[PDB]
Amino acid sequence: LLPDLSGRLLINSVFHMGAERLQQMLFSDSPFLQGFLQQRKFTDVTLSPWSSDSKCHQRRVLTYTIPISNQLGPKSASVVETQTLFRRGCVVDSEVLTQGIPYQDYFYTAHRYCILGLARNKARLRVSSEIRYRKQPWSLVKSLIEKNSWSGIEDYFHHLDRELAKAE
Ligand SMILES: C[C@H](CCCC(C)(C)O)[C@H]1CC[C@H]2[C@@H]3CC=C4C[C@@H](O)CC[C@]4(C)[C@H]3CC[C@]12C
């Protein structure tokens, strides 16, 4: 059904972990995801359980404070995230709103995780992303949002791919 996003393909790896286990690791209050957000220096991390009243999907929300490295404005920011899980393995859509940064009103980002089982203890992981503009900033500003966002997005997910790798 649902395809990739018209932005970039961040992750496309095959792991020798079950789709169930891999799903448990990424989309729950797992010690993996805990030890990982700690590793990328995220503070004030707060998770919610998945909703239940819905029939075809579920929803949760996350929040956490992140460090900003790009010499532009604050040296930290808050991030409210919303995840919707569709069981099929599974797929989950993520809306990430970063607050407290420059030009926060201009844009937000979307990400899609695809988990497809392959064998008893083997599954694939795909992650595509895209940038979504509520309003169009002029050339100078937009180039900067594209540049800094994709650098922080790739740096995040590439490290996420490596940590799942060393997890066995
Ligand atoms: C702070 C930067 C860029 C700031 C741009 C500017 C122009 C204010 O310097 C923002 C833009 C997009 C943000 C990421 C969106 C996707 C997620 C995935 C989630 O699991 C964890 C947070 C993360 C990595 C955001 C980090 C901050 C980002 C890079």
**At residue 131, what is the residue type?**
I
Q: Which of 112, 113, 158, 162 is nearest to 132 (CA)?
A: 112
How far is 5 from 129, CA to CA, in rounded Å? Answer: 6
The tokens describing 163, both together, are 């940590």
Q: Which of 88, 32, 21, 33 is nearest to 64 (CA)?
A: 33
In angstroms, what CA-CA distances link 129 with 50, 66, 114?
22, 19, 12
Q: What Å resolution does this PDB entry report? A: 2.9
Strands (E), the chain: 8-15, 43-47, 58-67, 76-87, 90-99, 107-119, 122-133
In this structure, the strands spanning 58-67 and 90-99 are unpaired
Most ligand 1 atoms within 8 A of CB, residue of 92, 96, 163 to mutate:
96
- Cβ-contact 15, 123 below 8 angstroms: yes
Is the beta carbon of 82 within 6 A of some atom in ligand 1?
A: no
Is the beta carbon of 103 within 6 A of some atom in ligand 1?
A: yes
Residues 6+ apart with CB under 8 A from 125: 11, 12, 13, 14, 15, 22, 113, 114, 115, 161, 164
- Cβ-contact 92, 85 below 8 angstroms: yes
For the chain, the C-alpha Rg in angstroms (whole number) is 16
Q: Give the angle subtended at the CA of 114 by the CAs of 77 and 4, to the nearest 5°.
A: 85
- Cβ-contact 93, 110 below 8 angstroms: yes
Experimental method: X-ray
List b or e across 140-166, with b for residues whose CB sees 16 or more CB atoms inside 10 angstroms.
Answer: eebeebeebbbebbeeebeebbeebee
